[PDB]
Amino acid sequence: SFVEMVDNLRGKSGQGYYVEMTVGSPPQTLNILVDTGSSNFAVGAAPHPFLHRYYQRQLSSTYRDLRKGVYVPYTQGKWEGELGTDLVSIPHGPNVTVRANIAAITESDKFFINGSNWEGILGLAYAEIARPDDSLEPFFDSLVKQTHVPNLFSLQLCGAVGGSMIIGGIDHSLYTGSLWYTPIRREWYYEVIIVRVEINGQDLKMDCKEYNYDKSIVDSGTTNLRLPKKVFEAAVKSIKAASSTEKFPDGFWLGEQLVCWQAGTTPWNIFPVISLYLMGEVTNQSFRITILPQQYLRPVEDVATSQDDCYKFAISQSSTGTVMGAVIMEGFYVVFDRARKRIGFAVSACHVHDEFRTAAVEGPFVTLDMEDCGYN
Ligand SMILES: CCCCNC(=O)[C@H](C)C[C@H](O)[C@@H]1C[C@H](C)CCc2cccc(c2)CS(=O)(=O)C[C@@H](C)C(=O)N1
Numbered sequence: 001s002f003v004e005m006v007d008n009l010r011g012k013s014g015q016g017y018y019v020e021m022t023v024g025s026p027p028q029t030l031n032i033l034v035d036t037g038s039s040n041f042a043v044g045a046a047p048h049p050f051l052h053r054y055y056q057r058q059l060s061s062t063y064r065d066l067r068k069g070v071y072v073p074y075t076q077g078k079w080e081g082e083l084g085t086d087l088v089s090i091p092h093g094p095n096v097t098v099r100a101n102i103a104a105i106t107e108s109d110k111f112f113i114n115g116s117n118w119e120g121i122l123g124l125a126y127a128e129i130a131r132p133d134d135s136l137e138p139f140f141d142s143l144v145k146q147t148h149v150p151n152l153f154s155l156q157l158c159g160a161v162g163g164s165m166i167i168g169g170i171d172h173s174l175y176t177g178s179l180w181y182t183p184i185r186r187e188w189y190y191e192v193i194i195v196r197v198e199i200n201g202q203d204l205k206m207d208c209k210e211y212n213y214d215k216s217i218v219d220s221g222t223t224n225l226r227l228p229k230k231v232f233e234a235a236v237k238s239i240k241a242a243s244s245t246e247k248f249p250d251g252f253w254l255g256e257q258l259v260c261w262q263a264g265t266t267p268w269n270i271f272p273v274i275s276l277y278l279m280g281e282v283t284n285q286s287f288r289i290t291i292l293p294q295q296y297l298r299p300v301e302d303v304a305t306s307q308d309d310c311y312k313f314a315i316s317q318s319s320t321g322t323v324m325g326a327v328i329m330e331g332f333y334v335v336f337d338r339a340r341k342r343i344g345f346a347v348s349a350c351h352v353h354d355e356f357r358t359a360a361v362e363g364p365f366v367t368l369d370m371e372d373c374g375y376n
Contacts, residue, residue, distance in 0.1 A: 001094075002171040008092035009034065009155075009163040011118065013223045013314070013326035014298060017157055018118035019165055022089045023102065024060025029053075029091075031118040034155065034165055036190050036336065037219030037323070039130040040072050041088075041139040042081060043120030045104030050112040051119055055104060062087045062099075070103045072131045075222070075320065079108035088139070093167045096147045100139045121221070124153070124336070128188035140338075143167075151339040155220055158350035159330040160299070175333035175346035180287040180363050182278040184341045185374060189217040192343060193374050194322060195286050195367045196277035197231070199238040206234060208373035215321035215375065218334065218343060222325035224255065225274075225296055226318035235274070235315065243270045252313055258300060260310040268293055268354060276324075279370050280363065281342065286370065287363030289345050294352045295327045295359070321375075331359045 011017040011033075018031040023043060030043055030053065044054040057063045064085045071080035081103045088100045105111075105120075112119075127134040127141060137145075144151045149168040156164040156174045164174060185191040194211040197204045213228045227235060236253055246267060251257035261267070271293030277286045298314040314327045331352040335344035345361045352359055 002166050002169055005092055005166050006164045006171060006174070007162055009157070009165055010161070011116070012161040013157070013159060013330060014300070015113050015116040016118065016221060017163055017326070019093070019122070020091050021120075021122070022091065023055055024057075024086050025062040027089065028055060028060065030055065030120050032120045032122045033118045033221060034124065035121050035219070035221030036124045036155070037217060037221045038072065038074065038121070038123035039125040039127060039138040040070070040103055040121070040123045040136070041100060042072065042079065042103035042105050044108075044112065045081060046106045048108065048112055050114045050116070054119060055102070057084065057104060060086055066101075068132070070132050072103070074111075077109065077111040079105045079111045081105040081107070083136070090167065093165075094147065094149050096143070096149065098142050098146045100142045101136050125189050126187040152335065152337045154333060154335040155329065156333050156348050156350060157220065157326055157330045158348070159295075159352065163350070170335055174349050176349060177347050177361065179333075179335060179344040179346045180361050181281050181337070181342040181344045182287070183281065184343060187341070189215065190219075190336060190343060191215050191217050192324075193279040193370065194276055195279050195370045195373050196288075197235075198275040199235065200242060200272035202238070204231070204234050204238070206231065209375055211322060212373055212375050213321060216324070217321065218324045218329070220326055220329060222323045223298070223327060224314045224316045224323070224325050225291070225328050226316050226323035226325060228321060229317055229319065231322070232315070232317040239272060242272045245270060255313050255316045258310050258312050260302065260308040263307060263309055266309050266311070269356070271297065273357060277365060277367060278345075279373070284366055284368055284370070285363070286365045286367040287361065288365060289332065290360040290362070291328060292331075292352050292354050292357055292359050294354060295330060298327055332361065
């Protein structure tokens with residue numbers, strides 16, 4: 001029955017991927033952003049300039065008020081609202097209905113995106129980071145407790161825009177090759193441990209603790225690859241060196257300004273591949289995922305005279321650890337195997353294409369002392 005969930009996502013990396021859901025009785029349809037970087041299920045519940053519809057609690061006969069407030073601050077953006085519960089379904093998901101916690105968003109700050117086509121957010125991470133505290137059961141925990149849906153989901157994010165969220169399993173038609181698994185270090189964010197970084201085959205040769213300072217997470221709700229300061233500087237220095245035969249606007253490397261080239265003349269060959277080595281399932285063993293420049297040069301429309309191919313640099317500096325965002329997940333099939341406390345990666349069936357290079361998931365590799373790469 002997973003074929004019913006193939007192609008159930010819409011959206012893009014820059015504005016997120018969303019799945020259709022219904023809340024309440026009678027069902028109210030809403031588009032919900034898929035966010036593995038948080039653990040609250042929340043929906044716009046009051047008028048907002050960027051919302052075309054919102055959750056109307058007074059129209060749902062199964063709505064229950066929890067008489068408790070809530071607010072969630074993200075890396076960028078935040079909202080506040082009122083907690084309650086209601087019946088929730090996923091039309092192109094498992095054929096079930098669950099009573100779930102819902103934060104009714106009443107005010108927000110730089111959270112909703114104009115023209116994104118989504119009205120709420122589905123935090124798929126663990127209760128430890130739920131607000132106001134870990135006693136607010138997240139949606140996926142409610143789903144597993146109330147139904148026989150297995151305790152895992154997988155995401156196929158396809159760039160360009162859509163993809164698939166397979167709830168309760170793995171759909172083998174969505175990937176090629178083998179799945180390689182990295183342990184979930186701790187159940188709060190989807191925290192992983194990066195054990196080596198290479199750019200065009202050259203090791204960054206940093207203390208691997210730097211790659212996970214102060215954590216590394218997998219986050220479908222973040223567009224970019226985000227790197228801690230020291231790692232970001234080394235990566236940008238290496239990427240600049242590899243591409244120095246081209247001139248880039250002021251602020252391109254800050255992700256602010258955009259770069260353009262005549263239609264179909266983007267010099268892909270001058271931008272390096274990035275290899276992230278992740279801790280494996282067995283002692284002293286890792287695997288690597290290889291990222292092409294078509295992933296970290298995010299294509300954007302040219303509102304001006306749309307003739308050229310324009311892009312933004314989709315790697316940015318972080319002060320809260322590494323974030324493997326949507327541009328990293330695109331082109332891979334990512335399995336959030338909560339039951340076995342592991343995350344799997346495989347080459348996606350909707351993978352990015354370069355003329356001479358290819359995104360890859362490869363292993364095994366030997367990596368000694370991987371335990372020292374985790375931050376404490
Ligand atoms: C309180 C406990 C949990 C908190 N979790 C977090 O804050 C996560 C680490 C980050 C989250 O996934 C958040 C979730 C965001 C706001 C959802 C809206 C969205 C979708 C796609 C792209 C962008 C924004 C632009 S963007 O710039 O990429 C935002 C990135 C920077 C962002 O904040 N994404």
